[PDB]
């Protein structure tokens, strides 16, 4: 639960944590605009 007490031990997890956020946001973006494209193509 605590960021620092995790990472005092394992520093690499700050990178693994920074990743897996930017990836999600990027993946969120694609679905939404693309699903919007077809929907606007429906009507």
């Amino acid at each position: 639960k605590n960021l620092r007490i995790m990472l005092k031990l394992n520093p690499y997890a700050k990178t693994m944590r920074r990743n897996t956020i930017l990836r999600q946001a990027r993946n969120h973006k694609l679905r939404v605009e693309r699903a919007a494209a077809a929907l606007a193509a429906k009507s």
Binding site: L3, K14, T15, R17, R18, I21, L22
Partner: protein
Amino acid sequence: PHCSRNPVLVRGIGRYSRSAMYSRKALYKRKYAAPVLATVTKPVGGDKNGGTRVVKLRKMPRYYPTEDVPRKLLSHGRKPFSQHVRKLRASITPGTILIILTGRHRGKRVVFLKQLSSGLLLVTGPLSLNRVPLRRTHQKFVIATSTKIDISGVKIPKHLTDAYFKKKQLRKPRHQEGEIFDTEKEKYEITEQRKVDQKAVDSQILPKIKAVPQLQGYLRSVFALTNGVYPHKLVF
């Protein structure tokens, strides 16, 4: 002094890594290889006889206690009240109408102006209608309704602060003996400056209110509960 070149992504993490920040702030092309009790220090003086004199600052104690108390250990993030972060519930926005439910002006419907730098809210249930002036109120001893108006165009003065809505009592010059000690007029009396402030605001609040029909009776009435009115069911 440049504002921070590392943006924020989540609290405690940034969007960039070490190698990239290095390049941004250019740590290349910025390499800095930079590599007998006689002395009477502070006290000084001058006076008449025998020559001059050397007066000594921060003199020593007279009286020592018989027993003292040790120090504390150290801690991280125990800020004081003048440094906290202020929050606010989401359903409260400038112009909203709010039900007071604790005090003397209890169960009345009022209007919200803004939030100060202490977490307390500024309220004017306009004195003509509700008999309720500029006051401070707490965001948690109140309900927000879903009933709103547009207030953006309005002039609230600068001088209106937590330092202005302060109580003033507890006067030490007293006999300290008798049937006394809340007797310096015993009472509260109104300045004119408050009056001036209430007038100058409600002058430009009130016309907007009358742009909504029936919005006055809602602001002269009083809220209460009765038979068959369970509050978790009713939306506000």
